[PDB]
Amino acid sequence: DTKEQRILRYVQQNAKPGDPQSVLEAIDTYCTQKEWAMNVGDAKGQIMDAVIREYSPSLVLELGAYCGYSAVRMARLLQPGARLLTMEINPDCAAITQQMLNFAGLQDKVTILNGASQDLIPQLKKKYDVDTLDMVFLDHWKDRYLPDTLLLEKCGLLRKGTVLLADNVIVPGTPDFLAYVRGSSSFECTHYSSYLEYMKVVDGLEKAIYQGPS
Ligand SMILES: Nc1ncnc2c1ncn2[C@@H]1O[C@H](CSCC[C@H](N)C(=O)O)[C@@H](O)[C@H]1O
Numbered sequence: 001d002t003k004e005q006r007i008l009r010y011v012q013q014n015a016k017p018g019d020p021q022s023v024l025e026a027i028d029t030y031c032t033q034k035e036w037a038m039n040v041g042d043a044k045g046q047i048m049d050a051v052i053r054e055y056s057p058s059l060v061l062e063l064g065a066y067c068g069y070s071a072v073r074m075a076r077l078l079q080p081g082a083r084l085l086t087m088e089i090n091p092d093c094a095a096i097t098q099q100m101l102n103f104a105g106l107q108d109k110v111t112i113l114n115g116a117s118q119d120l121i122p123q124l125k126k127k128y129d130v131d132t133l134d135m136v137f138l139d140h141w142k143d144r145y146l147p148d149t150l151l152l153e154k155c156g157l158l159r160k161g162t163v164l165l166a167d168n169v170i171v172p173g174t175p176d177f178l179a180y181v182r183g184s185s186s187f188e189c190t191h192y193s194s195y196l197e198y199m200k201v202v203d204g205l206e207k208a209i210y211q212g213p214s
């Protein structure tokens with residue numbers, strides 16, 4: 001009935017059960033042939049894959065799951081024992097994501113947190129027994145990138161070397177966030193170009209490594 005339900009049904013019929021790569025490809029194929037810009041582009045996948053491989057994070061926080069594409073992508077590269085937590089404000093999307101993870105066989109690696117990031121982040125330490133995050137992937141509402149970065153520092157969830165990787169920092173754009181992490185001695189930033197096909201525009205991802213309180 002909905003976009004998200006069709007995508008799921010498409011994966012379940014066409015992708016190989018247990019194989020995350022086939023799941024990611026069933027989705028890429030579907031958005032190619034069926035949908036307009038749901039952020040179609042291979043540079044983004046390349047960048048995400050390399051950041052995970054480069055820093056091998058033991059605990060990853062993802063903000064905004066949608067149908068579970070980025071969750072499947074990231075979690076498939078996680079070492080045994082490592083974990084992904086993904087926050088999703090929308091219960092229907094959270095339900096799809098769970099299904100998408102069960103099919104990919106990644107459900108034991110990932111935990112879906114139902115709610116708004118601004119409410120859940122202050123509960124990570126005491127309710128979800130989190131000490132510090134190794135990596136944060138910001139991909140939810142653009143006006144929450146900066147607030148949720150500040151909230152993560154404030155709740156003591158970042159440590160020296162925690163990787164922040166932020167998608168869509170150019171289109172539609174999160175310029176306050178960028179000016180902040182670039183301007184702060186507490187982050188060292190790198191920018192990665194990210195071409196999006198249907199809008200034929202160069203978007204970008206920002207990698208910001210926490211340097212400790214400053
Ligand atoms: N404050 C908030 N807390 C949690 N989730 C949010 C949020 N604001 C938006 N979202 C969710 O974040 C998602 C952005 S789309 C994310 C796409 C996903 N990263 C992927 O690559 O497939 C939407 O599903 C939206 O429901």
Ligand SMILES: [K+]
Pocket residue numbers: 180181182183184185186187188189
């Ligand atoms: K900086």
